[PDB]
Write an enzyme that holds these catalytic residues in place. Structure first.
Site, short mmCIF file in Angstrom:
data_model
loop_
_atom_site.label_atom_id
_atom_site.label_comp_id
_atom_site.label_asym_id
_atom_site.label_seq_id
_atom_site.Cartn_x
_atom_site.Cartn_y
_atom_site.Cartn_z
N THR A 76 0.80 -1.21 0.00
CA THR A 76 0.00 0.00 0.00
C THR A 76 0.83 1.26 0.00
O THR A 76 1.93 1.30 0.54
CB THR A 76 -0.92 -0.05 1.19
OG1 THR A 76 -1.71 -1.22 1.02
CG2 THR A 76 -1.83 1.14 1.26
N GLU B 165 -7.84 -5.69 3.12
CA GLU B 165 -8.28 -6.85 2.36
C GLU B 165 -9.60 -6.60 1.61
O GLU B 165 -10.53 -7.40 1.66
CB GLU B 165 -8.38 -8.06 3.30
CG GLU B 165 -7.37 -9.16 2.97
CD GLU B 165 -7.95 -10.17 2.00
OE1 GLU B 165 -7.97 -11.37 2.32
OE2 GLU B 165 -8.44 -9.74 0.93
N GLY C 59 2.77 -3.07 8.31
CA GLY C 59 3.01 -3.69 9.61
C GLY C 59 4.37 -4.35 9.74
O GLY C 59 4.80 -5.04 8.83
C1 LIG Z 1 -4.30 -1.18 10.32
C2 LIG Z 1 -3.89 -1.26 8.88
C3 LIG Z 1 -2.85 -2.06 8.53
C4 LIG Z 1 -2.48 -2.15 7.21
N1 LIG Z 1 -1.45 -2.94 6.89
C5 LIG Z 1 -1.05 -3.04 5.63
C6 LIG Z 1 0.08 -3.88 5.23
O1 LIG Z 1 0.70 -4.53 6.06
N2 LIG Z 1 0.43 -3.94 3.97
C7 LIG Z 1 -0.22 -3.26 3.05
O2 LIG Z 1 0.15 -3.36 1.88
N3 LIG Z 1 -1.25 -2.46 3.32
C8 LIG Z 1 -1.71 -2.31 4.56
N4 LIG Z 1 -2.80 -1.49 4.84
C9 LIG Z 1 -3.46 -0.74 3.79
C10 LIG Z 1 -4.90 -1.14 3.60
O3 LIG Z 1 -4.88 -2.29 2.77
C11 LIG Z 1 -5.65 -0.03 2.90
O4 LIG Z 1 -6.18 0.82 3.89
C12 LIG Z 1 -6.80 -0.52 2.03
O5 LIG Z 1 -6.40 -1.68 1.31
C13 LIG Z 1 -7.19 0.51 1.00
O6 LIG Z 1 -7.49 1.73 1.64
P1 LIG Z 1 -7.16 3.07 0.94
O7 LIG Z 1 -6.57 3.95 1.94
O8 LIG Z 1 -6.44 2.78 -0.30
O9 LIG Z 1 -8.57 3.66 0.56
P2 LIG Z 1 -9.09 4.06 -0.88
O10 LIG Z 1 -9.01 2.89 -1.75
O11 LIG Z 1 -8.52 5.35 -1.31
O12 LIG Z 1 -10.59 4.36 -0.55
C14 LIG Z 1 -11.00 5.62 -0.06
C15 LIG Z 1 -12.51 5.66 0.05
O13 LIG Z 1 -13.08 5.90 -1.23
C16 LIG Z 1 -13.92 4.84 -1.61
N5 LIG Z 1 -13.66 4.34 -2.98
C17 LIG Z 1 -12.49 3.94 -3.46
N6 LIG Z 1 -12.62 3.53 -4.74
C18 LIG Z 1 -13.90 3.66 -5.08
C19 LIG Z 1 -14.74 3.40 -6.26
N7 LIG Z 1 -14.22 2.92 -7.40
N8 LIG Z 1 -16.05 3.67 -6.19
C20 LIG Z 1 -16.59 4.15 -5.09
N9 LIG Z 1 -15.89 4.40 -3.98
C21 LIG Z 1 -14.58 4.19 -3.91
C22 LIG Z 1 -13.67 3.70 -0.66
O14 LIG Z 1 -14.89 3.03 -0.37
C23 LIG Z 1 -13.05 4.34 0.55
O15 LIG Z 1 -14.05 4.60 1.53
C24 LIG Z 1 -3.19 -1.38 6.17
C25 LIG Z 1 -4.25 -0.58 6.53
C26 LIG Z 1 -4.61 -0.49 7.85
C27 LIG Z 1 -5.76 0.38 8.25
#
Ligand SMILES: Cc1cc2nc3c(=O)[nH]c(=O)nc-3n(C[C@H](O)[C@H](O)[C@H](O)COP(=O)(O)OP(=O)(O)OC[C@H]3O[C@@H](n4cnc5c(N)ncnc54)[C@H](O)[C@@H]3O)c2cc1C
Ligand SMILES: Cc1cc2nc3c(=O)[nH]c(=O)nc-3n(C[C@H](O)[C@H](O)[C@H](O)COP(=O)(O)OP(=O)(O)OC[C@H]3O[C@@H](n4cnc5c(N)ncnc54)[C@H](O)[C@@H]3O)c2cc1C
Lengths: 682, 687
Positions: free
Chosen positions: A148, A437, A187
């Site tokens: 990410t 996920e 993590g």
């Molecule tokens: C505690 C924690 C641990 C993590 N650990 C890891 C890790 O070890 N390794 C790793 O790689 N990642 C990790 N992550 C990342 C995590 O996978 C991401 O938070 C998640 O996969 C995607 O979130 P984002 O921030 O990209 O949100 P986004 O994808 O930007 O989404 C933002 C918002 O917009 C909305 N949205 C997005 N696209 C669309 C669409 N096409 N249509 C309508 N609405 C949409 C979504 O519903 C969301 O509410 C971690 C996250 C957390 C919170």
């Protein structure tokens, strides 16, 4: 004879006294047989005995203490990395994840995500090599999973980190082009890891070949300092799981060997790129269906135990107030949640089974070996549809768990807010389970679109997944305004039809809207206009699948338990109507008169389930260690243990704050500066 | 020219150029005029600038640090207790609670709960006495409010702590008979309060006269030690509000003089005659104040988190295509709009609710406090002041419950709307939700408050059926609906009509109430009123819920009627969105009742979609319209100028300098582990 303080353990004794079945039979039914209940009970005993893993004091820990403790716990859990099979490793995780979601994750980041990925995407020579380095054993090696980015989470295809081929060195050059590309939420990176699996854009001779994986070392193992060109920092305070050390990573022209790239599905030699033009991701979502269940059952057990002993407000002229579990209003707030929690387990279990019975279906066939034909992409299609269904299941059950934590907390009143009862800590970690996920809202929108696609395949008379064949059906049910009789509304066969029907109607209505829209608009545009409808369709389709899966299991259940499970299953199916009264009315599946009858049927099914709650919650087979809340003690001795807890963690000998002299005393005893006003003539 | 990192502020400036109106006109509409906005701005700069009150590092605070800095913050706010009017006091507490709930509560238990109880239940002399002993000034005196027991929260009549009168000494003996009556969750008790107001069963000559109010000293003021018979400890870790030192209190034969019982309404003579029965439920008068104050918190905290989320929505891109291959802005996806914008309208509506309720509390307690219950002439004046307080009680309760649950839902939906960045402590959602949620429990458990309003609504219906007088708020329950549907559908024009939506909502509410009142009548033929209402508990909830929602929708339109014209159409869009969206949650209820047809639901969905698109064009203006500086945002991704990523990365690095790549447990835990020697399973020798 008994007072408010001493009444509870007695009352809990009468309730455990009401139980008409053998609890362990429901435990074997849930866990899938005698063999497995003994599997999970050896797991649980390891966890609860081990002094390092004790959770007694986790609720008072500050961020520093949690991190250190999590690290100690990970060290404690490491010998089971050699011993555990995939099933046990995963099971250990899920069960430990009921009380300690920080350690589960700090360990899972390596042994599930890093290892998962270098076994999954690496050639056998590679996996073998990293093992020699210490990977699996976790000697001088800790891994992590860097996918990410600050600017991209959901869109893997949009990642901006780059990996550029340099032939003169025969290396990859890993680069974060700007701060938007900074790896984020990783993590184990901030303080733990010596290597990551970096996800990066493959660049060779100025071409983008999509996203690949690479093993990037972060630290010089022997003093833990950062390798040249690797920047890392601690992301810091999180809403929850503060025991996990998520960090950001930035790469400035980091050079790794070409060999470090994982080449199972795509290869590089000397500028040459041979892709030879899945399971992990689905076995990860099915893992979270079961997570929703394991955690939910904890918080229901707490809340429902409490309800069996808490008394407030009674009207019956009896000497003692009414136990809140005996208020139909309260039964409504929690007993359908208990039913739901049962059905998540069923749902999780059925998705594992249908998953293995299809990856067997593909592999037992010769794709390459056509029997003069490959005509069986039907096995292939069923798989994709299963992968769609698993998306809605992940979303709505993780949301449901989240919703159950919150309802159960509120159901314990103010005592739900005490940290020692677990609701606060447990909601936060779980909310992370809703984002990672697959963003639940993205998932549901994808699934809905897939569902529309699939119905157009039906309308075009082509094969579709087994799981959505039903949209091609005609309904057994027609409401002429002559309202449905009780023996219909308490039928599983009928109830299953009603939901499939409502789900089919919705999908077919959406599908019609879409085609009609397409007349003036582009396909991607038309879905955007029907996104609410698409979300509804994911909702109804997942619920109906859940309703069916619960009934399908009762039928195979031991007879002694079966009438009770049926009572739980009916509550879940009818309750589900009540949450969606508008939906069933819009298709005229049911009538107004009918819903006032649904109303009474859940009432009536509440009283039945209510009778057996201690049994149906003792079924989950949790020791007080896994409850980890004094108000959910098996004992029922609620006020005594809660006070003891509060006093154990907070010794009250001193009536003053540590800031008494610095702050409180000088504020209470402050002097007054003068209100005198300066002299002036005239 | 731009990349992911540098794009957001450029996008935010564009979004902010779309605004069609002057932001401060909407801000003035929300505050009830330019004068009120000026006063609100004065409060906020004081809070912003005072370095004791700074919240920069608060997300990183452990409980012992929160505990201590909340005490400092309480100290720094204390000069305002002497100068503030009622309105200023409310507002200073509400505005500060946007970003620091611990200090708000820790101040509030004395100055709201404790003080309010001595004014509201003490005679003028009784009050003056504690005033003079430092109570109002907080000099050598800190108060708290000891109502709740381990055993009892909602049912105040079942409190088990006793106050038994002793004539020989002219004292009350305050006693906790077992651990179950331990006073519990008492804010300020653990560590700070010197005095308490304690609720207990008044016992005289072996007879329980019910729950009454007494001032009980807790500590010796000069060393802070516990008085004899008073036992206190700290409840410890809470889910949030960790800076508040909630304690438990046990009393063992603690003697107070008889004059400590607060005797405005209920009296006890030095011979032991309970000179009067209350003729009042005004022992809990202080609780109404803060239920009213909780409707505003719901607005204020909602508006903070909707502003974080929606400013982030306008800059975050995931999955798009564009002329330069920039991905789509999440706010341009229609589902995200429907996740947030109706909640934006909800929030605007909450303020309409908060203001009505506020105007009535301030009006009603002028009247109450200026009345003397020892005057026979004034008996007819207070007769109405009691029914005013009764009606206020009931109205506040349902509005408190639903507005605080709605805030809970907003905070929660906004968090997810920010994805994984919603889970970072620095963006505020975590501390926010955890601190917010206790509002749905305390000063009345929401569900139980809903049951109280449901009951009040049934009783109002009987008054109406008897043709007697009732509040303007509930009058509509009397009328026949102006709408009838023969199943041929409702057109678009009606569905975008304020009058029609209102009437639709009033019709749904009236019918549920009138039905519930019907079942009650049938039930009272065998049952007592009490037992009947419990049978009707689910029904009472339904009624509270619809009537409350109908009240807010109606209150929003009533204010849009009075607006400056230039803003009226944008405000109108929010109203209808709120209204139609509310149909959308309660679709069952409107088809149950033959108000809409199935074919109207399709149409409702489309209209919501339209209204969203129109409100989306102006989101920056409405959110801007809240009037929040970056201090009250307290979240990098909710920055005014939209430089989300720079500020977010800066906040994280500033709070966590990264110059050391090892953890503090390197030498003790991680190195030893990672460099652990091999376990020797070399087996023993045996023949
Ligand atoms: C505690 C924690 C641990 C993590 N650990 C890891 C890790 O070890 N390794 C790793 O790689 N990642 C990790 N992550 C990342 C995590 O996978 C991401 O938070 C998640 O996969 C995607 O979130 P984002 O921030 O990209 O949100 P986004 O994808 O930007 O989404 C933002 C918002 O917009 C909305 N949205 C997005 N696209 C669309 C669409 N096409 N249509 C309508 N609405 C949409 C979504 O519903 C969301 O509410 C971690 C996250 C957390 C919170
Ligand atoms: C952070 C915090 C601070 C607090 N500070 C103070 C303070 O300073 N001073 C003070 O006096 N108190 C304080 N309290 C106490 C608070 O007011 C109580 O939590 C609140 O009144 C709820 O009471 P309870 O927990 O006894 O709930 P209960 O009344 O025991 O209710 C438990 C559950 O049963 C349900 N229930 C109860 N009765 C019925 C019924 N008749 N029908 C159906 N369902 C029912 C309720 O909905 C609830 O879900 C505090 C609480 C908290 C959490």
């Amino acid at each position: 004879t008994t007072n408010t303080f001493t009444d509870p353990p007695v009352e809990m004794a009468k309730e455990r006294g009401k139980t008409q079945f053998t609890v362990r039979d429901v435990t074997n039914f849930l866990n899938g047989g005698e063999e497995e209940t003994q599997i999970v009970e050896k797991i649980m005993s390891s966890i609860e005995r081990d002094p390092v893993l004790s959770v007694t004091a986790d609720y008072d820990c500050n961020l520093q203490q949690a991190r250190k403790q999590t690290m100690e716990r990970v060290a404690a859990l490491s010998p089971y990395l050699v011993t555990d099979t995939e099933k046990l490793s995963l099971w250990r995780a899920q069960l430990h994840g009921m009380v300690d979601m920080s350690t589960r994750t700090r360990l899972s980041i390596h042994n599930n995500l890093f290892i998962g990925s270098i076994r999954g995407s690496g050639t056998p020579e590679q996996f073998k090599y990293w093992v020699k380095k210490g990977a699996v054993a976790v000697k001088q090696f800790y891994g992590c999973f860097a996918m990410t980015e600050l600017g991209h989470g959901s869109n893997l295809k949009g990642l901006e980190t780059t990996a550029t081929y340099d032939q003169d060195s025969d290396q990859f050059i890993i680069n974060t082009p700007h701060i938007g590309a900074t790896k984020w939420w990783i993590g184990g990176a901030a303080h733990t890891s010596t290597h990551c699996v970096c996800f990066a854009k493959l660049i060779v001779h100025g071409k983008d070949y999509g996203t690949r994986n690479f093993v990037v070392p972060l630290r010089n193992v022997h003093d833990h300092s950062l390798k040249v060109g690797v920047s890392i920092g601690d992301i810091g305070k999180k809403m929850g799981r503060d025991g996990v050390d998520n960090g950001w990573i930035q790469f400035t022209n980091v050079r790794i060997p070409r060999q470090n790239m994982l080449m199972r599905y795509a290869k590089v030699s000397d500028t040459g790129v041979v892709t030879k033009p899945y399971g992990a991701l689905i076995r990860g979502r099915v893992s979270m269906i079961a997570d929703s269940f394991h955690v939910s059952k904890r918080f229901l057990t707490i809340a429902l135990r409490y309800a069996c002993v808490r008394r407030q407000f009674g009207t019956s002229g009896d000497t003692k107030e009414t136990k809140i579990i005996d208020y139909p209003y309260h039964q409504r707030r929690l007993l359908p949640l208990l039913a739901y929690c049962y059905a998540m387990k069923m749902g999780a279990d059925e998705a594992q089974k249908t998953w293995i019975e299809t990856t067997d279906r593909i592999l037992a066939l010769n794709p390459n070996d056509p029997a003069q034909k490959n005509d069986l992409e039907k096995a292939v299609t069923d798989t994709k549809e299963l992968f769609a269904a698993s998306a809605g299941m992940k979303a709505f059950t993780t949301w449901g768990c989240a919703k159950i934590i919150d309802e159960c907390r509120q159901a314990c009143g103010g005592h739900g807010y005490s940290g020692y009862n677990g609701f606060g800590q447990g909601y936060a970690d779980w909310v992370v389970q809703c984002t990672w996920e697959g963003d639940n809202n993205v998932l549901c929108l994808s699934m809905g679109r897939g569902l529309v696609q699939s119905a157009l395949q039906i309308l075009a008379g082509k094969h579709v997944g087994a799981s959505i064949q039903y949209v091609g059906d005609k309904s057994k049910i027609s409401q002429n305004g002559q309202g449905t009789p009780r023996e219909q509304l308490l039928s599983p066969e009928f109830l299953v039809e009603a939901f499939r029907t409502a789900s089919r109607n919705n999908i077919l209505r959406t599908t019609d809207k879409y085609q009609e829209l397409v007349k003036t608009l582009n396909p991607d545009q038309a879905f955007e206009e029907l996104s609410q409808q698409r979300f509804q369709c994911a909702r109804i389709h997942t619920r109906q699948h859940l309703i069916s899966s619960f009934y399908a299991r009762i039928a195979t259940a031991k007879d002694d338990i079966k009438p009770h499970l049926l009572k739980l299953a009916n509550l879940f199916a009818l309750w589900s109507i009540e949450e969606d009264t508008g939906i069933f009315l819009r298709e005229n599946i049911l009538t107004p008169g009918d819903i006032d009858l649904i109303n009474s049927l859940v009432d009536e099914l509440c009283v039945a389930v209510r009778d057996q709650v201690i049994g149906l919650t003792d079924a989950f087979g949790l020791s007080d260690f896994f409850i980890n809340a004094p108000i959910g003690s098996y004992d029922g001795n609620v006020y005594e243990k809660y006070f003891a807890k509060v006093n154990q963690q907070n010794p009250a000998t001193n009536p003053r704050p540590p800031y008494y002299e610095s702050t409180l005393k000088p504020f209470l005893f402050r002097e007054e500066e003068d209100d005198e006003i300066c002299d002036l003539d005239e």
